[PDB]
Structure formats: structure tokens, C-alpha cells
């Protein structure tokens, strides 16, 4: 059965993501209920290629947290998953950055440099400043 | 006279940024009142080196819009301002990303790539997935 094999893969995925540490607190994603077993789904694209879908909820709805958790899920799974896979990840809510936090971001040199190196963003800017 | 040379400089800065196209709308920042003449301040850090401070307000408080306006201001003045300067930008409210927009972000190839290359974020991620 496709369906039961997909449930086996979802448990494998979950066993790898549960012990990822939160970007902010000294606890695991599982401990803080950012992820749980039911938040994973696996689908077949074609033999030898699976799509993994992970829903998660950061401890508070802040953009930088959501970004970082997304990065950790990809890094951990890319390194540790023993089958070829596409990954899609979804948060269940909008997020925000406080006045203080967004001003930090738009002035932080590392953050500015990374957006500048994004070819999609750099082209939008190119076209605004002409 | 320091004070008045600073006003001259703030008018030169303003004249450059007011014609920047908004990232989302078919208008300039000045038309949309994202910036105005009094939102620019210039200070002396020392001879041949001025701090330029720009306050702005995006048409709506969304993170991507604030990020892109910030980039455009920086590139514009980098390319056109005929004096050595440091730039600080400030938005006077927090911002948010809808559930739709934050999901696009955490799945978008270039956004993930750029974040991974930001040294602060990559070191955090390393520690979280170790
Ligand atoms: Zn908050
Ligand atoms: Zn945000
Ligand atoms: Zn909104």
C-alpha cells in the first residue's frame, strides 16, 4: 500500500525534526510543540522522489523565527533523510516584526547584503531606482 | 556653518530619493508620501563623511515592502550621492507578513539561499541542527 509506506516515511521525517533545537529557547522543536508527529505528510512524486510537507507553529509569530525554523528543517532533512525528496514547509498564521526588530533588519549589514545578493530583489531595486 | 550645510545636504538627498519608484505601486515614494522633505536629516561624522538618516512610512506596514524601500534608498544614494556617507533608515511602526506572504518566503529558492549565506543565521542554524 502506498498509504502505509507514506506513513512510515512521515515517521522517519518526524524522528529527524523533533530534536532540532528552537532558535530562541534551549528546548527542542518537539518540546515547545513547534512540531508534532501529525504535522508531517509524505507523498510520492514518482518512484525514488518523495514530497515531504511539514506544518509548524513557532512559539511566537515572529518572521525571523519562522525563517530560521524553516532553514533548520531543510538543513536537518537534507543531511539526514535517506531518500530523495522535495520539501515544502508551511506555517499556520501570519507573522510580525516589532518596530524595534524591523529597524534592526533594514539596517543590519548582513541582512542588507543577503537581500542585495538575491537576484529577484536586486532586479526590483534596479527597476525602482532608474 | 555646519547646521546650514547640513540642510543643503538633506535637500540633495531628498531630491534623489523622492523620484524612487515604489516596489509595488506605479508611483514615486514622494507621490505616495512614503518620504517627504522633512524626513531627511544629515549630520557630520567628521570632515568628508556624513551620516544620512531617512525616516519613511510604507503605504502599508508589510515587511517586504519596508525591506525593498530600504534597499532602494541605499542603492540610490550609493549610486548618486556625491559625498561619502553612512546611511541609517528608520520606519516608525512594526510590520507584518500575511500567512500567504510568509509561506511564499519560507519556500522561495532565492530567499532560502540568501538567508543561508547570512553568517549570523547560518551559525544559529548550525547550532540548532547539530
Ligand atoms: Zn510579537
Ligand atoms: Zn516580517
Ligand atoms: Zn497587511
Tab-separated table of C-alpha atoms and ligand atoms in Angstrom:
chain	number	residue	atom	x	y	z
A	1	UNK	CA	0.000	0.000	0.000
A	2	UNK	CA	1.225	3.459	-0.965
A	3	UNK	CA	-0.595	4.970	2.036
A	4	UNK	CA	1.190	2.901	4.720
A	5	UNK	CA	4.563	3.390	3.163
A	6	UNK	CA	3.818	7.147	3.233
A	7	UNK	CA	3.046	6.850	6.975
A	8	UNK	CA	6.397	5.056	7.571
A	9	UNK	CA	8.219	7.915	5.714
A	10	UNK	CA	6.375	10.525	7.763
A	11	UNK	CA	7.559	8.880	10.986
A	12	UNK	CA	11.136	8.867	9.668
A	13	UNK	CA	10.876	12.571	8.811
A	14	UNK	CA	9.427	13.304	12.211
A	15	UNK	CA	12.120	11.401	14.097
A	16	UNK	CA	14.681	13.715	12.473
A	17	UNK	CA	12.953	17.071	13.030
A	18	UNK	CA	11.710	16.604	16.586
A	19	UNK	CA	15.079	17.108	18.260
A	20	UNK	CA	16.048	20.248	16.340
A	21	UNK	CA	16.660	22.984	18.920
A	22	UNK	CA	14.488	26.152	18.863
A	23	UNK	CA	16.318	29.203	17.522
A	24	UNK	CA	15.451	31.074	20.734
A	25	UNK	CA	14.970	28.761	23.655
A	26	UNK	CA	17.079	25.882	24.952
A	27	UNK	CA	14.414	23.287	24.138
A	28	UNK	CA	13.617	21.091	21.106
A	29	UNK	CA	11.010	21.882	18.479
A	30	UNK	CA	9.059	18.895	19.824
A	31	UNK	CA	9.273	20.115	23.449
A	32	UNK	CA	7.913	23.514	22.522
A	33	UNK	CA	5.214	21.903	20.339
A	34	UNK	CA	6.524	23.736	17.221
A	35	UNK	CA	6.220	20.376	15.508
A	36	UNK	CA	4.435	17.103	16.330
A	37	UNK	CA	4.049	13.762	14.591
A	38	UNK	CA	0.787	14.783	12.914
A	39	UNK	CA	2.404	17.843	11.353
A	40	UNK	CA	4.203	15.750	8.738
A	41	UNK	CA	2.887	14.356	5.480
A	42	UNK	CA	4.768	12.438	2.791
A	43	UNK	CA	3.685	11.963	-0.837
A	44	UNK	CA	5.126	10.111	-3.833
A	45	UNK	CA	6.131	12.261	-6.812
A	46	UNK	CA	7.498	9.270	-8.714
A	47	UNK	CA	9.467	6.207	-7.586
A	48	UNK	CA	12.693	7.464	-5.961
A	49	UNK	CA	11.346	11.007	-5.316
A	50	UNK	CA	9.057	11.954	-2.422
A	51	UNK	CA	7.497	15.281	-1.427
A	52	UNK	CA	7.698	15.969	2.349
A	53	UNK	CA	5.256	18.541	3.791
A	54	UNK	CA	5.782	19.981	7.256
A	55	UNK	CA	3.456	22.275	9.160
A	56	UNK	CA	4.868	24.076	12.133
A	57	UNK	CA	3.993	26.830	14.602
A	58	UNK	CA	6.721	28.930	16.104
A	59	UNK	CA	6.440	29.774	19.823
A	60	UNK	CA	5.555	33.353	18.907
A	61	UNK	CA	4.509	34.581	15.416
A	62	UNK	CA	7.763	36.447	14.535
A	63	UNK	CA	9.149	36.457	10.981
A	64	UNK	CA	12.798	35.823	11.833
A	65	UNK	CA	11.818	32.781	13.931
A	66	UNK	CA	9.680	31.357	11.131
A	67	UNK	CA	12.500	31.862	8.645
A	68	UNK	CA	15.090	30.238	10.911
A	69	UNK	CA	12.884	27.206	11.721
A	70	UNK	CA	12.322	26.738	8.003
A	71	UNK	CA	16.068	26.788	7.439
A	72	UNK	CA	16.741	24.287	10.233
A	73	UNK	CA	14.091	21.847	8.854
A	74	UNK	CA	15.720	21.946	5.404
A	75	UNK	CA	19.304	21.587	6.656
A	76	UNK	CA	18.487	18.722	9.018
A	77	UNK	CA	16.456	16.818	6.417
A	78	UNK	CA	18.891	17.391	3.525
A	79	UNK	CA	21.677	15.950	5.647
A	80	UNK	CA	19.772	13.095	7.317
A	81	UNK	CA	16.883	11.890	5.152
A	82	UNK	CA	17.820	8.581	3.480
A	83	UNK	CA	15.621	9.082	0.377
A	84	UNK	CA	15.480	11.682	-2.418
A	85	UNK	CA	12.862	14.358	-1.605
A	86	UNK	CA	11.374	17.741	-2.333
A	87	UNK	CA	10.491	19.700	0.868
A	88	UNK	CA	7.618	22.129	1.344
A	89	UNK	CA	7.029	23.829	4.721
A	90	UNK	CA	4.049	25.787	5.957
A	91	UNK	CA	3.270	27.979	8.954
A	92	UNK	CA	-0.358	28.268	10.061
A	93	UNK	CA	-0.506	32.018	10.640
A	94	UNK	CA	0.900	35.379	9.584
A	95	UNK	CA	3.912	36.698	11.427
A	96	UNK	CA	5.161	40.096	12.537
A	97	UNK	CA	8.314	42.072	13.363
A	98	UNK	CA	8.148	44.731	16.125
A	99	UNK	CA	9.178	48.346	15.241
A	100	UNK	CA	12.411	47.667	17.002
A	101	UNK	CA	13.003	44.376	15.142
A	102	UNK	CA	12.258	45.568	11.558
A	103	UNK	CA	14.509	48.625	12.042
A	104	UNK	CA	17.216	46.313	13.173
A	105	UNK	CA	16.713	44.258	9.975
A	106	UNK	CA	16.710	47.094	7.450
A	107	UNK	CA	19.903	48.495	8.961
A	108	UNK	CA	21.719	45.188	9.732
A	109	UNK	CA	24.605	44.969	7.243
A	110	UNK	CA	24.451	41.140	6.945
A	111	UNK	CA	20.730	41.265	6.273
A	112	UNK	CA	21.114	44.049	3.721
A	113	UNK	CA	23.946	42.213	1.990
A	114	UNK	CA	21.897	38.975	1.763
A	115	UNK	CA	18.884	40.686	0.165
A	116	UNK	CA	21.192	42.541	-2.200
A	117	UNK	CA	22.589	39.206	-3.315
A	118	UNK	CA	19.099	37.874	-4.022
A	119	UNK	CA	18.763	38.277	-7.775
A	120	UNK	CA	14.979	38.767	-7.647
A	121	UNK	CA	15.169	41.535	-5.085
A	122	UNK	CA	18.231	43.179	-6.738
A	123	UNK	CA	16.319	43.409	-10.028
A	124	UNK	CA	13.246	45.022	-8.384
A	125	UNK	CA	15.573	47.607	-6.852
A	126	UNK	CA	17.343	48.120	-10.180
A	127	UNK	CA	13.964	48.921	-11.611
A	128	UNK	CA	12.895	51.251	-8.787
A	129	UNK	CA	15.975	53.403	-8.766
A	130	UNK	CA	16.223	54.004	-12.546
B	1	UNK	CA	28.278	76.816	9.094
B	2	UNK	CA	27.671	73.175	9.989
B	3	UNK	CA	23.913	73.424	10.594
B	4	UNK	CA	23.116	75.045	7.217
B	5	UNK	CA	25.479	72.919	5.139
B	6	UNK	CA	23.557	70.007	6.709
B	7	UNK	CA	20.294	71.458	5.377
B	8	UNK	CA	21.784	71.803	1.853
B	9	UNK	CA	22.870	68.115	2.050
B	10	UNK	CA	19.433	66.989	3.252
B	11	UNK	CA	17.841	68.750	0.256
B	12	UNK	CA	20.281	66.999	-2.134
B	13	UNK	CA	19.437	63.618	-0.512
B	14	UNK	CA	15.775	64.352	-0.745
B	15	UNK	CA	15.909	65.375	-4.337
B	16	UNK	CA	17.414	61.972	-5.178
B	17	UNK	CA	15.114	59.709	-3.119
B	18	UNK	CA	11.804	61.426	-3.911
B	19	UNK	CA	11.814	60.041	-7.512
B	20	UNK	CA	12.442	56.435	-6.477
B	21	UNK	CA	9.618	54.185	-7.768
B	22	UNK	CA	7.642	52.300	-5.136
B	23	UNK	CA	8.230	48.483	-5.233
B	24	UNK	CA	4.545	47.674	-5.553
B	25	UNK	CA	2.713	50.743	-6.880
B	26	UNK	CA	3.134	52.723	-10.154
B	27	UNK	CA	4.193	55.909	-8.324
B	28	UNK	CA	7.185	57.554	-6.676
B	29	UNK	CA	7.840	57.468	-2.970
B	30	UNK	CA	7.180	61.166	-2.820
B	31	UNK	CA	3.780	60.898	-4.648
B	32	UNK	CA	2.742	58.162	-2.178
B	33	UNK	CA	4.114	60.217	0.768
B	34	UNK	CA	6.356	57.376	1.848
B	35	UNK	CA	9.008	60.104	2.203
B	36	UNK	CA	8.988	63.898	2.414
B	37	UNK	CA	11.497	66.710	2.640
B	38	UNK	CA	11.497	66.780	6.479
B	39	UNK	CA	12.126	63.020	6.732
B	40	UNK	CA	15.787	63.542	5.843
B	41	UNK	CA	18.463	64.602	8.263
B	42	UNK	CA	22.186	64.870	7.647
B	43	UNK	CA	24.868	65.034	10.381
B	44	UNK	CA	28.632	65.451	10.395
B	45	UNK	CA	30.590	62.362	11.480
B	46	UNK	CA	33.718	64.342	10.555
B	47	UNK	CA	35.004	66.311	7.527
B	48	UNK	CA	34.332	64.450	4.246
B	49	UNK	CA	31.975	61.931	5.992
B	50	UNK	CA	28.280	62.492	6.845
B	51	UNK	CA	25.584	60.387	8.474
B	52	UNK	CA	22.332	60.469	6.436
B	53	UNK	CA	19.151	59.446	8.319
B	54	UNK	CA	15.964	58.817	6.449
B	55	UNK	CA	12.593	58.091	8.118
B	56	UNK	CA	9.916	56.681	5.899
B	57	UNK	CA	6.458	55.119	6.092
B	58	UNK	CA	5.444	52.456	3.574
B	59	UNK	CA	1.840	52.675	2.177
B	60	UNK	CA	1.095	49.567	4.260
B	61	UNK	CA	3.124	48.095	7.135
B	62	UNK	CA	4.397	44.970	5.387
B	63	UNK	CA	7.862	43.633	5.908
B	64	UNK	CA	8.799	43.006	2.230
B	65	UNK	CA	7.679	46.456	1.238
B	66	UNK	CA	9.759	48.040	4.014
B	67	UNK	CA	12.752	45.911	3.163
B	68	UNK	CA	12.641	46.820	-0.533
B	69	UNK	CA	12.178	50.542	0.051
B	70	UNK	CA	15.141	50.441	2.367
B	71	UNK	CA	17.270	48.725	-0.292
B	72	UNK	CA	16.256	51.254	-2.944
B	73	UNK	CA	17.156	54.221	-0.760
B	74	UNK	CA	20.575	52.691	-0.078
B	75	UNK	CA	21.337	51.871	-3.703
B	76	UNK	CA	20.070	55.214	-4.974
B	77	UNK	CA	22.289	57.215	-2.680
B	78	UNK	CA	25.237	54.859	-3.158
B	79	UNK	CA	24.968	55.498	-6.887
B	80	UNK	CA	24.120	59.240	-6.912
B	81	UNK	CA	25.061	60.996	-3.706
B	82	UNK	CA	28.250	62.983	-4.407
B	83	UNK	CA	29.639	62.818	-0.850
B	84	UNK	CA	30.953	59.968	1.381
B	85	UNK	CA	28.170	58.876	3.730
B	86	UNK	CA	26.822	56.307	6.168
B	87	UNK	CA	23.026	55.734	5.897
B	88	UNK	CA	20.583	54.924	8.667
B	89	UNK	CA	16.923	54.272	7.805
B	90	UNK	CA	14.009	54.104	10.164
B	91	UNK	CA	10.451	53.075	9.822
B	92	UNK	CA	8.171	54.271	12.629
B	93	UNK	CA	5.955	51.223	13.144
B	94	UNK	CA	6.325	47.468	13.178
B	95	UNK	CA	5.415	45.456	10.142
B	96	UNK	CA	3.833	42.146	9.275
B	97	UNK	CA	3.697	39.406	6.657
B	98	UNK	CA	0.385	37.717	5.929
B	99	UNK	CA	0.198	33.923	6.168
B	100	UNK	CA	0.252	33.794	2.368
B	101	UNK	CA	3.327	36.018	2.067
B	102	UNK	CA	5.366	34.343	4.841
B	103	UNK	CA	4.723	30.939	3.288
B	104	UNK	CA	5.911	32.169	-0.107
B	105	UNK	CA	9.043	33.414	1.617
B	106	UNK	CA	9.969	30.366	3.547
B	107	UNK	CA	9.632	28.218	0.421
B	108	UNK	CA	11.202	30.557	-2.127
B	109	UNK	CA	14.557	29.305	-3.520
B	110	UNK	CA	16.443	32.620	-3.557
B	111	UNK	CA	15.190	33.738	-0.179
B	112	UNK	CA	16.344	30.474	1.368
B	113	UNK	CA	19.715	30.723	-0.441
B	114	UNK	CA	20.330	34.302	0.725
B	115	UNK	CA	19.359	33.511	4.311
B	116	UNK	CA	21.698	30.503	4.365
B	117	UNK	CA	24.560	32.776	3.283
B	118	UNK	CA	23.945	35.232	6.102
B	119	UNK	CA	26.692	34.358	8.628
B	120	UNK	CA	24.593	35.197	11.698
B	121	UNK	CA	21.692	32.921	10.557
B	122	UNK	CA	23.947	30.051	9.343
B	123	UNK	CA	25.737	29.875	12.693
B	124	UNK	CA	22.416	29.729	14.534
B	125	UNK	CA	21.163	27.004	12.222
B	126	UNK	CA	24.370	25.007	12.682
B	127	UNK	CA	23.851	25.080	16.455
B	128	UNK	CA	20.149	24.099	16.140
B	129	UNK	CA	20.617	21.019	13.956
B	130	UNK	CA	23.911	19.721	15.442
C	1	LIG	ZN1	5.183	39.571	18.695
C	2	LIG	ZN1	8.479	40.179	8.642
C	3	LIG	ZN1	-1.180	43.801	5.998
